[PDB]
Amino acid sequence: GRGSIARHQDDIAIEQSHFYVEKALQNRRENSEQFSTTYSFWTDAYVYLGNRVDADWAFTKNNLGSVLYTTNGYDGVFVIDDRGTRYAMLEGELSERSLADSLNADTGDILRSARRAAVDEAAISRYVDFDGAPAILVASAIKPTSDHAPIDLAKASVMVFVDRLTPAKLAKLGGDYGIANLHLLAGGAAGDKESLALEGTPHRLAWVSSRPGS
Amino acid sequence: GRGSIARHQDDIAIEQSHFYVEKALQNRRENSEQFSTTYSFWTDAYVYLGNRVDADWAFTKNNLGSVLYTTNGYDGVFVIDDRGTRYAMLEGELSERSLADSLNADTGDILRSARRAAVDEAAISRYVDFDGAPAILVASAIKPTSDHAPIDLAKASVMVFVDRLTPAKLAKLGGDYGIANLHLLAGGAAGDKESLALEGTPHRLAWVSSRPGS
């Protein structure tokens, strides 16, 4: 036997808490990537949101409309292409504010990455500063299903879902994963709290280290 | 202060393991409930599946087709109404086997429960024995969105999604939540393993007692 390594119970609790905050975020992102490909790998979406955007089909007829906010919690829903933002829904209402104006991240990178990932039937996800708030962004190319003739993914439009990590959403997420008082770290010092970075943003999530799930 | 209560470290680990398995299941169920209403609260779905089921639209045109299995992992996708099963897709292929023949649970109960929940814009979920295997079932009424004229939900058809808890899905779910060797309990005794019941089924989930995550 090499011998055991005994650990401080607080160190174990802190390690578990970081593990479960990371898993909460990863699981949220993977669920949202699946949601995005559900809405974007869809022949109807390719017809009505590829090329010219039919806001009547998307918003008035509720095919990509306010429910995505009032039920699914996507504070931002966008269709973008090489010219920029072609459709914008902010908090369930039509908006003229472009995705690029709302984000710290480069939207051309989002467009290109979503186009490439669509080759593997995949979406992309990342963290962003959405108008000064932490958010998870997911994006996937708008393409028809396999019964349709093939298209060139290099020119496909891209659907974007922006999930702002509000105090209420963070508190529910923390409860979902047994984390005590998950919140956006206010100042620059965590002090008594543990914290992690939402990489690609200046935001950090912080929480009180207690025995998680107890 | 009342004074502290010190606990056995293995007892804490066991309590945390039960907490995170229960959260793993609840979060999976809530996600599938959202997925179900994404597909069922949909005017096109009401048109092509609400009464007579158009399998060309659903399967050939991939609006409710094989991707729901090959990407989203739903081993069973059904449309049911007062007459029984109107549409059945098993492992991504059209099937003649009814939902009622596949379940231990009563499908009239599912129809009624979903038709009611739709009044509150909700789906329903439960655990089932799906042809001898543990599964999560979710169901929601097929109804158009609010721009459409009102319909009678009491006569609406119901979409049903069946997520079979295969060994691969269970191992991945367990890893998602820091659980060691999550599996379908083989025999009748867990012995050294922890277990919980999938209520409404004879199935139990079992796992090896470890410090979760860590």
Numbering used by the authors:
A (entry chain A), B (entry chain B): 36 to 249
Which sentences did the original study use to describe this structure?
Cyclic dimeric guanosine monophosphate (c-di-GMP) serves as a bacterial second messenger that modulates various processes including biofilm formation, motility, and host-microbe symbiosis. Here, we show that iron regulates c-di-GMP levels in Pseudomonas aeruginosa by modulating the interaction between an iron-sensing protein, IsmP, and a diguanylate cyclase, ImcA. Binding of iron to the CHASE4 domain of IsmP inhibits the IsmP-ImcA interaction, which leads to increased c-di-GMP synthesis by ImcA, thus promoting biofilm formation and reducing bacterial motility. Our prediction results reflected that ImcA contains six membrane-spanning domains and a GGDEF domain while IsmP is a multi-domain protein comprised of several domains including the PASPAC (IsmP273-413), GGDEF (IsmP413-585), EAL (IsmP585-865), and CHASE4 (IsmP59-220) domains.
We solved the crystal structure of CHASE4IsmP at 1.9 Å resolution with P22121 symmetry. Each CHASE4 domain contains two discontinuous subdomains: the membrane-distal subdomain and the membrane-proximal subdomain connected by a loop. The former exhibits an alpha+beta fold pattern, which contains a core five-stranded β-sheet, with other helices distributed on both sides of β-sheet; the latter mainly contains a three-stranded β-sheet, which is connected with the former through short α8 helix. The dimeric form is maintained by a pseudo-symmetric interface mainly consisting of several polar bonds mediated by Q51, W55, K96, 97 N, T180, D182, W212 and P247 from either chain in a dimer. In addition, the sidechain of N107 interacted with the Q69 from the other monomer via a hydrogen bond. Furthermore, the native-PAGE and SEC results indicated that CHASE4 domain exists as a dimeric form in solvent. The isothermal titration calorimetric (ITC) analysis showed that CHASE4 efficiently bound to trivalent Fe3+ with an approximate Kd of 7 μM but it did not bind to Mn2+, Mg2+ and Fe2+. Due to advances of computational biology, a putative Fe3+-bound CHASE4 rough model could be established based on in silico analysis. Clearly, at least three amino acids, including E65, N66, and Q69 may play a key role in the Fe3+ binding to CHASE4 according to this model. ITC assays demonstrated stronger binding affinity of IsmPCHASE4 towards Fe3+, however, the IsmPCHASE4 mutants exhibited weaker, even no binding affinity with Fe3+, suggesting the critical role of E65, N66, Q69 in Fe3+ sensing and ultimately binding.
